Amino acid sequence: FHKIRNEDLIFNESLGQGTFTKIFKGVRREVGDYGQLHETEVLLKVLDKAHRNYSESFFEAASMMSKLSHKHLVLNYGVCVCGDENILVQEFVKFGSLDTYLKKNKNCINILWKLEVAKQLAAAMHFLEENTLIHGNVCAKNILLIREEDRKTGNPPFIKLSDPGISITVLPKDILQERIPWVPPECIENPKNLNLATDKWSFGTTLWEICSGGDKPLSALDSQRKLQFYEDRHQLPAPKAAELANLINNCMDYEPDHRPSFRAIIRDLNSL
Ligand SMILES: N#Cc1ccc(Nc2nc(N)n(C(=O)Nc3ccccc3)n2)cc1
């Protein structure tokens, strides 16, 4: 990771928080191409000082993403580890996370929008699967909307997958349980079961989010009831707009070996 000086970063408004992290809009002063000076909008992800022990997993998350280059994977500019802070410096995506975009735009997002976003996510996960790289935290909050759909120009929406954050292989047990049903049942049983098949399950959950206008599946269940949901081998309800319901359940297969490759997922998406 390229090291960025604290003096070159300006922290502006908070944009929320993630697991043991706080998120800020910021500005990076930098010398760019041809020696031109730029003041670039950036997304600054700050690991909580009280959780500095998760720094290696905080940064191994992004670093994996950033050893590969792909149009659907978020760009990391570098890190700032001056002083006591652990900061990931990331491209700033105009329209933020998909989970909140889906909510604020329910009565405006149709099946063709959801299908194109689903295809793009499948393309990014296919690229990861071909490179045998595990993401570990596929969810709507981790999908960034680069570009809105512009019907008047034929332009589809364009999304990127963000970095996974601290791995579920080191997170507290209660956080993992609150992440049901994104975290697969085999990883609730044993977090060290994290596997390429993990992302197939979470991709199913993420499609459910995309089809459900920002609702969180099982949000009404507390952690104990979510565990029992897995113990009784339940599937999620079909979204009202059920066009993707079969793919969702096919991906969320309690047998990890039976979950379809992302190539087959793309083939099924292209038939709708
Ligand atoms: N209101 C508003 C707003 C919020 C965010 C953004 N933009 C933006 N750009 C990036 N790269 N982003 C994230 O990686 N986010 C994130 C993902 C997971 C966990 C925590 C944060 N988020 C733009 C607008």
UniProtKB/Swiss-Prot annotation:
Tissue/organ expression: Ubiquitously expressed throughout most tissues.
Location of Phosphotyrosine modifications: Y34
Entry function: Non-receptor tyrosine kinase involved in various processes such as cell growth, development, differentiation or histone modifications. Mediates essential signaling events in both innate and adaptive immunity. In the cytoplasm, plays a pivotal role in signal transduction via its association with type I receptors such as growth hormone (GHR), prolactin (PRLR), leptin (LEPR), erythropoietin (EPOR), thrombopoietin receptor (MPL/TPOR); or type II receptors including IFN-alpha, IFN-beta, IFN-gamma and multiple interleukins.
Family membership: Belongs to the protein kinase superfamily. Tyr protein kinase family. JAK subfamily.
Range within the parent protein: 537 to 808 of 1132
Cellular compartment(s): Endomembrane system; Cytoplasm; Nucleus
Source organism superkingdom: Eukaryota
Noted disease: Chromosomal aberrations involving JAK2 are found in both chronic and acute forms of eosinophilic, lymphoblastic and myeloid leukemia. Translocation t(8;9)(p22;p24) with PCM1 links the protein kinase domain of JAK2 to the major portion of PCM1. Translocation t(9;12)(p24;p13) with ETV6. Budd-Chiari syndrome: A syndrome caused by obstruction of hepatic venous outflow involving either the hepatic veins or the terminal segment of the inferior vena cava. Obstructions are generally caused by thrombosis and lead to hepatic congestion and ischemic necrosis. Clinical manifestations observed in the majority of patients include hepatomegaly, right upper quadrant pain and abdominal ascites.
Subunit annotation: Interacts with EPOR, LYN, SIRPA, SH2B1 and TEC. Interacts with IL23R. Interacts with SKB1. Interacts with STAM2. Interacts with IFNGR2 (via intracellular domain). Interacts with LEPR (Isoform B). Interacts with HSP90AB1; promotes functional activation in a heat shock-dependent manner. Interacts with STRA6. Interacts with RHEX; this interaction occurs in a erythropoietin (EPO)-dependent manner. Interacts with ASB2; the interaction targets JAK2 for Notch-induced proteasomal degradation. Interacts with MPL/TPOR.
Post-translational events: Autophosphorylated, leading to regulate its activity. Also phosphorylated by TEC. Phosphorylated on tyrosine residues in response to interferon gamma signaling. Phosphorylated on tyrosine residues in response to a signaling cascade that is activated by increased cellular retinol. Undergoes Notch-induced ubiquitination and subsequent proteasomal degradation which is mediated by ASB1 or ASB2, the substrate-recognition components of probable ECS E3 ubiquitin-protein ligase complexes.
Domain notes: Possesses 2 protein kinase domains. The second one probably contains the catalytic domain, while the presence of slight differences suggest a different role for protein kinase 1.
Gene: JAK2
UniProt name for this protein: Tyrosine-protein kinase JAK2
Chain positions of site Breakpoint for translocation to form PCM1-JAK2 fusion protein: D174, I175
The Protein kinase domain, residue ranges: 9-272
